[PDB]
Amino acid sequence: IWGCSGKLICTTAVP
Amino acid sequence: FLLTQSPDSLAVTLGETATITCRSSRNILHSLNNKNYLAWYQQRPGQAPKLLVIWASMRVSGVADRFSGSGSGTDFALTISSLQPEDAAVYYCQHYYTTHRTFGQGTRVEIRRTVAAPSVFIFPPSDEQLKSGTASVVCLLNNFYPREAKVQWKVDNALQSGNSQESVTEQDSKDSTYSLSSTLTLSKADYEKHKVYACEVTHQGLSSPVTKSFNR
Amino acid sequence: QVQLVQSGGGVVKPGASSRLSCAASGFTFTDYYMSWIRQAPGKGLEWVAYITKDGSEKKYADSLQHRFAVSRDNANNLVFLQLNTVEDDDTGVYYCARDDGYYDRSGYYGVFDLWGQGIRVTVSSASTKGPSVFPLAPSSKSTSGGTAALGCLVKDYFPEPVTVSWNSGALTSGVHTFPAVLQSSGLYSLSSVVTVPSSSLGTQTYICNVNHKPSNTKVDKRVEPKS
Lengths: 15, 216, 227
Ligand SMILES: [Mg+2]
What we know:
Helices cover 0% and strands 27% of the residues of chain A. Chain A is an all-beta fold. The radius of gyration of chain A is 7 Å and the shape is flat. In chain C, the strands form four sheets. In chain C, strands 2, 4, 5, 6, 9, 10 and 11 form a seven-stranded mixed beta sheet that branches. In chain C, strands 12, 13, 15, 16 and 17 form a five-stranded antiparallel beta sheet that branches. In chain C, strands 1-3-8-7 form a four-stranded antiparallel beta sheet, with no helix packed on it. Chain C is elongated, with a radius of gyration of 21 Å. It is classed as immune system.
Protein backbone atom coordinates (compact mmCIF):
# COMPACT_ATOMS: atom_id res chain seq x y z
CA ILE A 1 0.00 0.00 0.00
CA TRP A 2 2.97 2.49 -0.61
CA GLY A 3 6.26 2.23 -2.53
CA CYS A 4 8.21 2.94 -5.69
CA SER A 5 9.06 1.06 -8.89
CA GLY A 6 12.34 2.83 -9.49
CA LYS A 7 12.43 6.55 -8.87
CA LEU A 8 11.36 9.47 -11.05
CA ILE A 9 7.63 9.24 -10.70
CA CYS A 10 7.85 9.19 -6.90
CA THR A 11 10.55 11.86 -6.69
CA THR A 12 8.18 14.18 -8.62
CA ALA A 13 4.65 13.17 -7.52
CA VAL A 14 4.18 15.31 -4.38
CA PRO A 15 4.12 19.03 -5.26
CA PHE B 1 -11.34 4.92 -21.32
CA LEU B 2 -10.00 6.52 -24.54
CA LEU B 3 -7.28 8.96 -25.42
CA THR B 4 -7.92 10.57 -28.80
CA GLN B 5 -5.05 12.39 -30.41
CA SER B 6 -5.52 15.16 -32.92
CA PRO B 7 -4.53 15.55 -35.63
CA ASP B 8 -3.45 12.20 -37.09
CA SER B 9 -0.88 13.96 -39.25
CA LEU B 10 0.87 17.28 -39.30
CA ALA B 11 3.19 19.14 -41.63
CA VAL B 12 5.22 21.79 -39.76
CA THR B 13 8.02 24.02 -41.08
CA LEU B 14 11.58 24.12 -39.69
CA GLY B 15 11.87 26.72 -36.92
CA GLU B 16 8.10 26.82 -36.38
CA THR B 17 5.59 25.36 -33.93
CA ALA B 18 3.74 22.04 -33.85
CA THR B 19 0.76 21.31 -31.60
CA ILE B 20 -0.53 17.85 -30.82
CA THR B 21 -3.85 17.47 -28.97
CA CYS B 22 -4.68 14.66 -26.55
CA ARG B 23 -8.28 14.34 -25.23
CA SER B 24 -9.23 11.91 -22.50
CA SER B 25 -12.70 10.39 -22.08
CA ARG B 26 -12.51 11.19 -18.36
CA ASN B 27 -10.62 13.29 -15.82
CA ILE B 28 -7.10 12.21 -14.97
CA LEU B 29 -6.26 14.62 -12.13
CA HIS B 30 -5.82 13.03 -8.67
CA SER B 31 -6.62 14.81 -5.38
CA LEU B 32 -3.54 13.99 -3.29
CA ASN B 33 -1.16 16.16 -5.41
CA ASN B 34 -3.49 17.89 -7.93
CA LYS B 35 -1.55 16.72 -10.95
CA ASN B 36 -2.71 15.20 -14.21
CA TYR B 37 -1.41 11.66 -14.83
CA LEU B 38 -0.52 11.96 -18.51
CA ALA B 39 2.75 11.34 -20.36
CA TRP B 40 4.16 12.03 -23.84
CA TYR B 41 6.47 9.87 -25.98
CA GLN B 42 8.50 10.41 -29.15
CA GLN B 43 9.10 7.60 -31.64
CA ARG B 44 11.49 8.15 -34.54
CA PRO B 45 11.01 5.48 -37.18
CA GLY B 46 12.90 2.20 -36.52
CA GLN B 47 13.34 3.23 -32.88
CA ALA B 48 11.44 2.52 -29.72
CA PRO B 49 9.43 5.30 -28.01
CA LYS B 50 11.28 7.85 -25.90
CA LEU B 51 9.56 9.43 -22.91
CA LEU B 52 9.55 13.28 -22.92
CA VAL B 53 6.97 14.59 -20.44
CA ILE B 54 5.34 13.34 -17.26
CA TRP B 55 2.64 14.88 -15.10
CA ALA B 56 1.26 16.54 -18.29
CA SER B 57 3.77 19.44 -18.21
CA MET B 58 7.08 18.32 -16.65
CA ARG B 59 9.97 17.76 -19.01
CA VAL B 60 12.28 14.82 -18.33
CA SER B 61 16.08 14.98 -18.10
CA GLY B 62 17.83 15.33 -21.48
CA VAL B 63 14.80 16.74 -23.30
CA ALA B 64 15.04 20.11 -25.03
CA ASP B 65 12.99 23.07 -23.81
CA ARG B 66 11.21 23.10 -27.21
CA PHE B 67 9.01 20.25 -26.01
CA SER B 68 6.36 21.70 -23.67
CA GLY B 69 3.35 20.02 -22.10
CA SER B 70 0.11 21.72 -21.08
CA GLY B 71 -3.56 21.36 -20.15
CA SER B 72 -5.93 20.11 -17.47
CA GLY B 73 -9.13 18.11 -16.98
CA THR B 74 -9.49 16.12 -20.18
CA ASP B 75 -7.62 18.32 -22.66
CA PHE B 76 -3.89 18.36 -23.15
CA ALA B 77 -1.29 19.39 -25.63
CA LEU B 78 2.26 18.89 -26.60
CA THR B 79 3.92 21.81 -28.38
CA ILE B 80 7.23 21.82 -30.18
CA SER B 81 8.70 25.26 -30.77
CA SER B 82 11.63 26.12 -33.07
CA LEU B 83 11.21 22.82 -34.94
CA GLN B 84 14.32 20.76 -35.79
CA PRO B 85 14.89 17.93 -38.26
CA GLU B 86 15.27 15.39 -35.46
CA ASP B 87 11.71 16.15 -34.28
CA ALA B 88 10.36 14.35 -37.32
CA ALA B 89 8.65 11.41 -35.63
CA VAL B 90 5.39 10.08 -34.17
CA TYR B 91 4.21 11.38 -30.77
CA TYR B 92 1.91 9.48 -28.42
CA CYS B 93 0.16 10.49 -25.22
CA GLN B 94 -0.29 7.96 -22.42
CA HIS B 95 -2.28 8.12 -19.18
CA TYR B 96 -1.45 6.42 -15.90
CA TYR B 97 -4.53 7.45 -13.95
CA THR B 98 -5.47 3.81 -13.45
CA THR B 99 -3.69 0.45 -13.68
CA HIS B 100 -5.04 0.08 -17.21
CA ARG B 101 -2.76 2.36 -19.15
CA THR B 102 -3.76 3.30 -22.68
CA PHE B 103 -2.13 5.35 -25.38
CA GLY B 104 -3.39 7.81 -27.94
CA GLN B 105 -3.39 6.58 -31.56
CA GLY B 106 -0.36 8.75 -32.37
CA THR B 107 0.41 11.93 -34.30
CA ARG B 108 3.00 12.12 -37.10
CA VAL B 109 5.00 15.28 -37.55
CA GLU B 110 6.24 15.76 -41.09
CA ILE B 111 8.72 18.60 -41.70
CA ARG B 112 8.74 21.30 -44.35
CA ARG B 113 12.09 22.53 -45.69
CA THR B 114 13.48 24.12 -48.87
CA VAL B 115 13.20 22.21 -52.15
CA ALA B 116 16.17 19.89 -52.77
CA ALA B 117 16.69 18.13 -56.07
CA PRO B 118 17.46 14.42 -56.07
CA SER B 119 20.77 12.86 -57.03
CA VAL B 120 19.90 10.04 -59.47
CA PHE B 121 21.93 6.79 -59.57
CA ILE B 122 21.32 3.57 -61.55
CA PHE B 123 22.48 0.01 -60.95
CA PRO B 124 22.49 -2.81 -63.48
CA PRO B 125 21.74 -6.37 -62.43
CA SER B 126 24.70 -8.23 -60.92
CA ASP B 127 26.24 -11.18 -62.70
CA GLU B 128 25.36 -13.14 -59.58
CA GLN B 129 21.61 -12.67 -60.22
CA LEU B 130 21.84 -13.21 -63.99
CA LYS B 131 22.55 -16.93 -63.40
CA SER B 132 19.09 -17.19 -61.72
CA GLY B 133 16.90 -16.28 -64.76
CA THR B 134 15.60 -13.10 -63.15
CA ALA B 135 17.16 -9.62 -63.70
CA SER B 136 16.63 -6.62 -61.32
CA VAL B 137 17.56 -3.03 -62.22
CA VAL B 138 17.58 -0.45 -59.48
CA CYS B 139 17.21 3.32 -59.76
CA LEU B 140 18.01 5.44 -56.68
CA LEU B 141 16.74 9.02 -56.11
CA ASN B 142 18.76 10.40 -53.23
CA ASN B 143 18.13 13.08 -50.64
CA PHE B 144 15.35 15.22 -52.12
CA TYR B 145 12.43 17.39 -50.96
CA PRO B 146 9.50 17.44 -51.33
CA ARG B 147 8.37 13.82 -51.21
CA GLU B 148 6.45 14.07 -54.50
CA ALA B 149 8.66 12.56 -57.23
CA LYS B 150 7.99 10.75 -60.51
CA VAL B 151 10.04 7.84 -62.01
CA GLN B 152 9.75 6.41 -65.56
CA TRP B 153 11.40 3.27 -66.91
CA LYS B 154 12.42 3.06 -70.54
CA VAL B 155 13.79 -0.17 -72.07
CA ASP B 156 15.07 0.63 -75.58
CA ASN B 157 13.24 3.93 -75.13
CA ALA B 158 9.95 2.07 -74.69
CA LEU B 159 7.95 3.07 -71.64
CA GLN B 160 7.50 0.33 -69.03
CA SER B 161 4.50 -0.47 -66.82
CA GLY B 162 3.43 -3.29 -64.50
CA ASN B 163 6.98 -4.39 -63.67
CA SER B 164 8.51 -1.98 -61.15
CA GLN B 165 8.20 -1.23 -57.41
CA GLU B 166 8.97 1.76 -55.20
CA SER B 167 9.93 2.32 -51.61
CA VAL B 168 10.34 5.78 -50.06
CA THR B 169 12.40 6.30 -46.92
CA GLU B 170 11.22 7.93 -43.74
CA GLN B 171 12.21 11.56 -43.49
CA ASP B 172 15.91 11.98 -42.68
CA SER B 173 16.77 13.10 -39.13
CA LYS B 174 19.52 15.51 -40.28
CA ASP B 175 18.48 17.17 -43.56
CA SER B 176 14.71 16.31 -43.61
CA THR B 177 14.94 14.81 -47.12
CA TYR B 178 13.53 11.69 -48.71
CA SER B 179 15.13 8.96 -50.75
CA LEU B 180 13.52 6.67 -53.27
CA SER B 181 14.28 3.31 -54.85
CA SER B 182 12.54 2.03 -57.98
CA THR B 183 13.31 -1.57 -58.95
CA LEU B 184 12.51 -2.87 -62.43
CA THR B 185 12.26 -6.67 -62.55
CA LEU B 186 12.46 -8.69 -65.79
CA SER B 187 13.23 -12.24 -66.83
CA LYS B 188 16.84 -12.88 -67.87
CA ALA B 189 15.59 -13.59 -71.44
CA ASP B 190 13.73 -10.27 -71.76
CA TYR B 191 16.70 -8.46 -70.18
CA GLU B 192 19.00 -9.83 -72.89
CA LYS B 193 16.54 -8.97 -75.67
CA HIS B 194 17.22 -5.21 -75.21
CA LYS B 195 20.18 -2.81 -74.98
CA VAL B 196 19.32 0.58 -73.45
CA TYR B 197 17.98 0.69 -69.88
CA ALA B 198 16.92 4.18 -68.76
CA CYS B 199 15.47 5.73 -65.58
CA GLU B 200 13.76 9.13 -66.15
CA VAL B 201 13.11 11.27 -63.08
CA THR B 202 10.76 14.24 -62.59
CA HIS B 203 10.96 16.37 -59.45
CA GLN B 204 10.13 19.98 -58.60
CA GLY B 205 13.79 20.77 -57.86
CA LEU B 206 14.80 19.75 -61.40
CA SER B 207 14.58 22.33 -64.19
CA SER B 208 13.81 19.45 -66.59
CA PRO B 209 13.64 15.62 -66.14
CA VAL B 210 16.91 13.81 -65.35
CA THR B 211 17.67 10.57 -67.14
CA LYS B 212 20.28 7.95 -66.19
CA SER B 213 20.81 4.96 -68.45
CA PHE B 214 23.24 2.18 -69.34
CA ASN B 215 23.87 -0.35 -72.11
CA ARG B 216 23.77 -4.07 -71.32
CA GLN C 1 25.29 1.09 -19.91
CA VAL C 2 21.51 1.18 -19.17
CA GLN C 3 19.87 -1.10 -21.74
CA LEU C 4 17.26 -3.72 -22.71
CA VAL C 5 18.09 -6.26 -25.41
CA GLN C 6 15.33 -8.38 -26.91
CA SER C 7 15.41 -11.76 -28.65
CA GLY C 8 12.97 -14.28 -30.08
CA GLY C 9 10.07 -13.65 -32.42
CA GLY C 10 9.73 -14.41 -36.11
CA VAL C 11 7.01 -16.41 -37.80
CA VAL C 12 4.36 -18.36 -35.83
CA LYS C 13 1.33 -20.38 -36.95
CA PRO C 14 -2.19 -19.57 -35.78
CA GLY C 15 -3.02 -21.39 -32.53
CA ALA C 16 0.66 -21.99 -31.71
CA SER C 17 2.98 -20.43 -29.10
CA SER C 18 5.91 -18.03 -29.15
CA ARG C 19 8.31 -16.89 -26.43
CA LEU C 20 9.84 -13.41 -26.23
CA SER C 21 12.86 -12.43 -24.15
CA CYS C 22 14.48 -9.31 -22.74
CA ALA C 23 17.93 -9.08 -21.11
CA ALA C 24 18.55 -6.07 -18.83
CA SER C 25 21.87 -4.42 -17.93
CA GLY C 26 23.23 -1.16 -16.52
CA PHE C 27 20.71 -0.79 -13.69
CA THR C 28 19.36 -2.43 -10.54
CA PHE C 29 16.89 -4.80 -12.18
CA THR C 30 15.30 -5.71 -8.83
CA ASP C 31 14.20 -2.08 -8.31
CA TYR C 32 11.83 -1.92 -11.27
CA TYR C 33 8.48 -3.22 -12.44
CA MET C 34 8.79 -4.45 -15.98
CA SER C 35 6.25 -4.20 -18.79
CA TRP C 36 5.56 -5.52 -22.26
CA ILE C 37 3.98 -3.29 -24.95
CA ARG C 38 3.08 -4.03 -28.55
CA GLN C 39 2.64 -1.92 -31.63
CA ALA C 40 0.14 -3.25 -34.20
CA PRO C 41 -1.12 -1.30 -37.25
CA GLY C 42 -4.65 0.08 -37.42
CA LYS C 43 -4.20 0.41 -33.64
CA GLY C 44 -0.82 1.81 -32.44
CA LEU C 45 0.63 1.37 -28.94
CA GLU C 46 -0.84 -1.19 -26.60
CA TRP C 47 0.26 -2.12 -23.08
CA VAL C 48 -0.08 -5.88 -22.64
CA ALA C 49 1.35 -6.73 -19.18
CA TYR C 50 3.56 -5.88 -16.26
CA ILE C 51 5.34 -7.80 -13.53
CA THR C 52 6.24 -6.53 -10.05
CA LYS C 53 9.79 -6.12 -8.67
CA ASP C 54 9.17 -9.53 -7.27
CA GLY C 55 6.56 -10.55 -4.79
CA SER C 56 5.50 -11.88 -8.12
CA GLU C 57 2.20 -10.29 -8.87
CA LYS C 58 1.46 -9.89 -12.58
CA LYS C 59 -1.26 -7.92 -14.41
CA TYR C 60 -2.54 -8.21 -17.98
CA ALA C 61 -4.88 -6.45 -20.37
CA ASP C 62 -8.27 -8.20 -20.44
CA SER C 63 -8.70 -8.01 -24.21
CA LEU C 64 -5.97 -10.70 -24.12
CA GLN C 65 -8.22 -13.42 -22.82
CA HIS C 66 -5.55 -14.86 -20.38
CA ARG C 67 -3.56 -15.82 -23.52
CA PHE C 68 -0.29 -14.14 -22.51
CA ALA C 69 2.03 -15.04 -19.61
CA VAL C 70 4.78 -12.79 -18.28
CA SER C 71 7.61 -14.09 -16.08
CA ARG C 72 10.94 -12.90 -14.77
CA ASP C 73 14.41 -14.10 -13.77
CA ASN C 74 16.18 -11.84 -11.28
CA ALA C 75 19.50 -13.63 -11.33
CA ASN C 76 20.05 -13.54 -15.02
CA ASN C 77 18.25 -10.20 -15.48
CA LEU C 78 15.59 -11.53 -17.86
CA VAL C 79 11.93 -10.91 -18.61
CA PHE C 80 9.83 -13.14 -20.75
CA LEU C 81 6.59 -12.89 -22.59
CA GLN C 82 4.86 -16.06 -23.69
CA LEU C 83 2.17 -15.73 -26.37
CA ASN C 84 -0.37 -18.62 -26.54
CA THR C 85 -3.00 -19.57 -29.15
CA VAL C 86 -1.89 -16.63 -31.24
CA GLU C 87 -4.39 -15.08 -33.66
CA ASP C 88 -4.25 -12.71 -36.61
CA ASP C 89 -4.45 -9.81 -34.11
CA ASP C 90 -1.04 -10.61 -32.63
CA THR C 91 1.11 -9.68 -35.60
CA GLY C 92 3.27 -6.65 -34.74
CA VAL C 93 6.28 -5.21 -32.94
CA TYR C 94 6.65 -6.21 -29.28
CA TYR C 95 8.71 -4.12 -26.87
CA CYS C 96 9.74 -4.84 -23.29
CA ALA C 97 10.05 -1.63 -21.26
CA ARG C 98 11.37 -0.55 -17.87
CA ASP C 99 8.38 0.52 -15.81
CA ASP C 100 8.77 3.51 -13.46
CA GLY C 101 6.03 4.51 -11.03
CA TYR C 102 4.49 4.51 -7.57
CA TYR C 103 2.03 2.10 -5.94
CA ASP C 104 -0.43 2.70 -3.12
CA ARG C 105 -3.47 0.76 -1.79
CA SER C 106 -5.50 1.62 -4.88
CA GLY C 107 -2.98 0.26 -7.43
CA TYR C 108 0.16 1.12 -9.41
CA TYR C 109 0.63 4.26 -11.53
CA GLY C 110 3.56 4.19 -13.93
CA VAL C 111 5.42 5.29 -17.01
CA PHE C 112 7.83 3.63 -19.44
CA ASP C 113 11.29 5.28 -19.27
CA LEU C 114 13.51 2.72 -21.01
CA TRP C 115 12.48 0.51 -23.93
CA GLY C 116 13.96 -2.53 -25.67
CA GLN C 117 14.77 -2.35 -29.40
CA GLY C 118 11.65 -4.22 -30.49
CA ILE C 119 10.98 -7.65 -31.97
CA ARG C 120 8.57 -8.47 -34.82
CA VAL C 121 6.13 -11.34 -34.50
CA THR C 122 4.24 -12.47 -37.61
CA VAL C 123 1.27 -14.80 -37.36
CA SER C 124 1.36 -16.77 -40.63
CA SER C 125 0.97 -20.20 -42.18
CA ALA C 126 3.57 -19.22 -44.82
CA SER C 127 7.02 -20.76 -44.56
CA THR C 128 10.28 -19.05 -43.62
CA LYS C 129 12.70 -18.10 -46.39
CA GLY C 130 16.16 -16.62 -46.04
CA PRO C 131 17.23 -13.81 -48.37
CA SER C 132 19.64 -13.84 -51.30
CA VAL C 133 21.90 -10.77 -51.43
CA PHE C 134 23.20 -9.08 -54.61
CA PRO C 135 25.56 -6.10 -54.94
CA LEU C 136 24.60 -2.73 -56.34
CA ALA C 137 28.07 -2.04 -57.70
CA PRO C 138 29.26 1.57 -58.11
CA SER C 139 30.06 2.50 -61.73
CA SER C 140 30.15 5.48 -64.12
CA LYS C 141 26.36 5.24 -64.01
CA SER C 142 26.27 6.04 -60.27
CA THR C 143 28.92 8.83 -59.93
CA SER C 144 27.20 12.21 -59.92
CA GLY C 145 29.99 14.62 -58.87
CA GLY C 146 32.09 13.74 -56.95
CA THR C 147 29.89 11.27 -55.04
CA ALA C 148 29.44 7.55 -55.76
CA ALA C 149 26.53 5.39 -54.68
CA LEU C 150 26.46 1.69 -53.96
CA GLY C 151 24.35 -0.83 -52.08
CA CYS C 152 22.95 -4.34 -51.74
CA LEU C 153 19.71 -5.71 -53.03
CA VAL C 154 18.21 -8.09 -50.47
CA LYS C 155 15.67 -10.26 -52.24
CA ASP C 156 13.09 -13.01 -51.63
CA TYR C 157 12.82 -13.37 -47.84
CA PHE C 158 10.05 -14.11 -45.34
CA PRO C 159 8.97 -12.94 -42.89
CA GLU C 160 10.01 -9.42 -41.96
CA PRO C 161 12.39 -8.08 -40.90
CA VAL C 162 15.92 -7.95 -42.24
CA THR C 163 18.43 -5.50 -40.81
CA VAL C 164 21.30 -4.15 -42.87
CA SER C 165 24.46 -2.61 -41.52
CA TRP C 166 27.66 -1.67 -43.31
CA ASN C 167 31.20 -2.50 -42.28
CA SER C 168 29.90 -4.10 -39.10
CA GLY C 169 28.20 -0.91 -37.89
CA ALA C 170 31.13 1.40 -38.58
CA LEU C 171 29.49 2.83 -41.72
CA THR C 172 26.22 4.73 -40.94
CA SER C 173 26.49 8.18 -42.55
CA GLY C 174 24.91 8.35 -46.03
CA VAL C 175 23.16 4.98 -45.50
CA HIS C 176 19.56 4.53 -46.56
CA THR C 177 18.01 1.15 -45.84
CA PHE C 178 14.67 1.19 -47.60
CA PRO C 179 11.37 -0.10 -46.17
CA ALA C 180 10.66 -3.51 -47.67
CA VAL C 181 8.32 -4.17 -50.59
CA LEU C 182 5.84 -7.01 -50.86
CA GLN C 183 6.34 -8.89 -54.12
CA SER C 184 3.55 -10.72 -55.92
CA SER C 185 5.26 -13.97 -54.85
CA GLY C 186 4.41 -13.12 -51.23
CA LEU C 187 8.10 -12.68 -50.36
CA TYR C 188 9.87 -9.50 -49.31
CA SER C 189 12.66 -7.42 -50.82
CA LEU C 190 14.59 -4.25 -50.02
CA SER C 191 17.70 -2.31 -50.93
CA SER C 192 20.27 -0.68 -48.65
CA VAL C 193 22.29 2.05 -50.31
CA VAL C 194 25.10 4.39 -49.35
CA THR C 195 26.86 7.38 -50.87
CA VAL C 196 30.61 7.62 -50.57
CA PRO C 197 33.49 9.53 -52.13
CA SER C 198 34.02 8.33 -55.67
CA SER C 199 37.70 9.31 -55.26
CA SER C 200 38.39 6.41 -52.91
CA LEU C 201 36.39 3.50 -54.40
CA GLY C 202 39.81 1.96 -55.00
CA THR C 203 41.08 1.93 -51.44
CA GLN C 204 37.99 1.52 -49.30
CA THR C 205 36.08 -1.61 -48.50
CA TYR C 206 32.30 -1.80 -48.39
CA ILE C 207 30.53 -4.81 -46.87
CA CYS C 208 26.77 -5.42 -46.35
CA ASN C 209 25.80 -7.12 -43.15
CA VAL C 210 22.37 -8.58 -43.84
CA ASN C 211 20.69 -10.16 -40.86
CA HIS C 212 17.45 -12.17 -41.25
CA LYS C 213 16.84 -13.26 -37.68
CA PRO C 214 13.64 -15.25 -38.27
CA SER C 215 15.82 -17.72 -40.27
CA ASN C 216 19.07 -17.12 -38.32
CA THR C 217 20.63 -16.18 -41.64
CA LYS C 218 23.66 -13.88 -41.90
CA VAL C 219 25.09 -12.73 -45.23
CA ASP C 220 28.14 -10.50 -45.60
CA LYS C 221 28.63 -9.22 -49.16
CA ARG C 222 31.57 -7.26 -50.47
CA VAL C 223 30.46 -4.61 -52.96
CA GLU C 224 33.27 -4.03 -55.44
CA PRO C 225 33.30 -1.46 -58.19
CA LYS C 226 32.89 -3.07 -61.53
CA SER C 227 34.38 -4.69 -63.41
MG1 LIG D 1 13.53 15.71 -40.44
